[model samples]
Target: EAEFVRICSKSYLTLENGKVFLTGGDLPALDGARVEFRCDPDFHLVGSSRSVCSQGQWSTPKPHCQVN
Candidate 1:
């Protein structure tokens, strides 16, 4: 049997404008142990709720409300 694998986040806790809220099952496992992560500098993060993700990719960390 294969063990579970979680794609850990490199960028963390960048909650913009209080628009995002994670609760209950949405949260990851953390129990006093410290962890380290590194973001993908080669791939930029981009998007928001209205247009957060596009074509399976994010637009700009926060959506522009219009695509230009």
Candidate 2:
């Protein structure tokens, strides 16, 4: 499987709540499909992360805390 790249409609340095939270432009068409994300210490998300496609709702969008 390929790494899911969420192409942003608008650049999101950090994910937002109550937003559309679309893919980063590289990800495949959601089509209401399941989307997954890994909260790695390596990623270093400062806050929370949510996948709209997966949950069909917005949760906490994790902060991309630390980029390797």
Q: Can you write out model 2's per-residue Cα lDDT over 1-68, one digit (the tens) per residue?
A: 22344332233333332222345334353324323344444554444444444222333343444465
lDDT (C-alpha, whole model) for all candidates: 0.27, 0.38
How many steric overlaps are in each model, in order? 5, 14
Candidate 1 residues 1-68, lDDT tens each?
21232221213323322222222121222212222222243432243432222222223343222222
Candidate 2 deviant stretches above 4 angstroms: 1-31, 39-43, 54-63
State model 1's lDDT.
0.27
